[PDB]
Structure 1
Amino acid sequence: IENKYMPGLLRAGYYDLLIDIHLSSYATARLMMNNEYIVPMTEETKSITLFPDENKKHGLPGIGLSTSLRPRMQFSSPSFVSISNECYQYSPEFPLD
């Protein structure tokens, strides 16, 4: 991902591989749930308002407090010395930050 001298085809292939092995599963899970809005009845939900402050200025998209239910984010460490098979469920962990 970092290298600036990598061939374009290999760069695209490695980007696609990084997306597929680690991110595509949860990305598809959230895309499949976007068009549904199941919001619980809580105090955080009550606190939500259309406009951040008194004047009617739109806030930045995305930022704010969203209380709608979302799919939960699951990851497993890909270690081949362990003999447990429960690691096969979920996608391999990656340093997201």
Structure 2
Amino acid sequence: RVAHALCSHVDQAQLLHALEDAHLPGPLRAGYYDLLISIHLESACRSRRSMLSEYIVPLTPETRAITLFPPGRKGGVTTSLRPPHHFIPLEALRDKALRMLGEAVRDGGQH
């Protein structure tokens, strides 16, 4: 029914516009972000996190190479197996998001 609500209206386009969009009511902005996440929608993310809690080991030579080095430390090549999302602007939404964060630090200038 959420998919139907999304058909509403709102709209995928409306949501994209809102994200690109700046200003407006605080209650409104937050509400819009929340609605998009819920219906965009995140649900899949929750399922994925739950699956993601456990660790599953795969047996492929590429997987075999992995390993970590002490001299060195870094943040993030994963052999873990997680079901592909059944499933928007995917990589596109992602690009928009990466862009917003930068805009955000800039706004998050001082005073």
TM superposition score category, shorter chain reference? 0.5 to 0.7
Post-superposition shift, 1:14?
0.6
Residue 74, structure 1, aligned to residue 86, structure 2:
yes
- Between Structure 1 and Structure 2, how many residues are aligned? 73
Distance 1:23 1:46 in 2: 35
| 1:33 alignment partner, SS class | helix
Which of 35, 45, 48 is matched with 1:17 structurally?
35
Residue 39, structure 1, aligned to residue 57, structure 2:
yes
The two structures, once aligned, show a CA RMSD in angstroms of 1.5
Post-superposition shift, 1:96?
1.3
Post-superposition shift, 1:38?
0.9
Segments of 5+ residues of structure 2 without an aligned counterpart are: 1-18, 92-111
**Letter of the structure 2 residue corresponding to residue 95 of structure 1:** P
Which of the two has greater strand per residue?
Answer: 1
Distance 2:40 2:86 in 1: 11
Post-superposition shift, 1:74?
1.6
Structure 1 segments (4+ residues) deviating >2 Å: none
TM-score, with structure 2 as normaliser: 0.59
Distance 1:74 1:42 in 2: 25
* 1:3 paired residue number: 21
Distance 2:79 2:66 in 1: 9
